[PDB]
Amino acid sequence: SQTYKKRADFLSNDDYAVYVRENIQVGMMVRCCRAYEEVCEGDVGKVIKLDRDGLHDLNVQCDWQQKGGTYWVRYIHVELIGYPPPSSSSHIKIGDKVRVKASVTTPKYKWGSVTHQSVGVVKAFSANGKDIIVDFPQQSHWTGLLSEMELVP
């Protein structure tokens, strides 16, 4: 997994912004490292558009998982995650319909009343980012390991 530097690896926002600019690509996962307007720190976003304006302009449009929608940020607002490897985590947003992957025989936090046929709406991410809380028709407030969860087609 190609690891990227964070703001703490540079002397100045300008430095770090240049690094992000040099490395960020549409499709990349990024983490918000400096809260900005609708994007809280720690929100994770898929870059959906890059504008190439001034170094500190609102050049990074992501689809933010916790915000649940798109928001433009500056380079210094994000730290690059990159292209997570196959399935290791998917781009799932609050508000998305998810289901337990068929590849999961038993979810980390048990099935409860959820089946593979259950379709739930993501309502929150755990503080560690590894878990989502999902409201299924059969069971609200169901916690799943995000890695065992997938968007419903």
Swiss-Prot record:
It is found in: Cytoplasm; Cytoplasm, Cytoskeleton, Microtubule organizing center, Centrosome, Centriole; Nucleus. Residues 7-83 form the CPH domain. Disulfide bonds: none annotated. Sumoylated with SUMO1 by PIAS4 in response to double-strand breaks (DSBs), promoting the interaction with RNF8. E3 ubiquitin-protein ligase that regulates ubiquitin-dependent retention of repair proteins on damaged chromosomes. Recruited to sites of DNA damage in response to ionizing radiation (IR) and facilitates the assembly of UBE2N and RNF8 promoting DNA damage-induced formation of 'Lys-63'-linked ubiquitin chains. Acts as a mediator of binding specificity between UBE2N and RNF8. Involved in the maintenance of RNF168 levels. E3 ubiquitin-protein ligase that promotes the ubiquitination and proteasomal degradation of XPA which influences the circadian oscillation of DNA excision repair activity. It is linked to Intellectual developmental disorder, autosomal recessive 38: A disorder characterized by significantly below average general intellectual functioning associated with impairments in adaptive behavior and manifested during the developmental period. MRT38 is characterized by global developmental delay affecting motor, speech, adaptive, and social development. Patients manifest autistic features, aggression, self-injury, impulsivity, and distractibility. The ZZ-type zinc finger mediates binding to SUMO1, and at low level SUMO2. Interacts with XPA. Interacts with NEURL4. Via its interaction with NEURL4, may indirectly interact with CCP110 and CEP97. This is E3 ubiquitin-protein ligase HERC2.
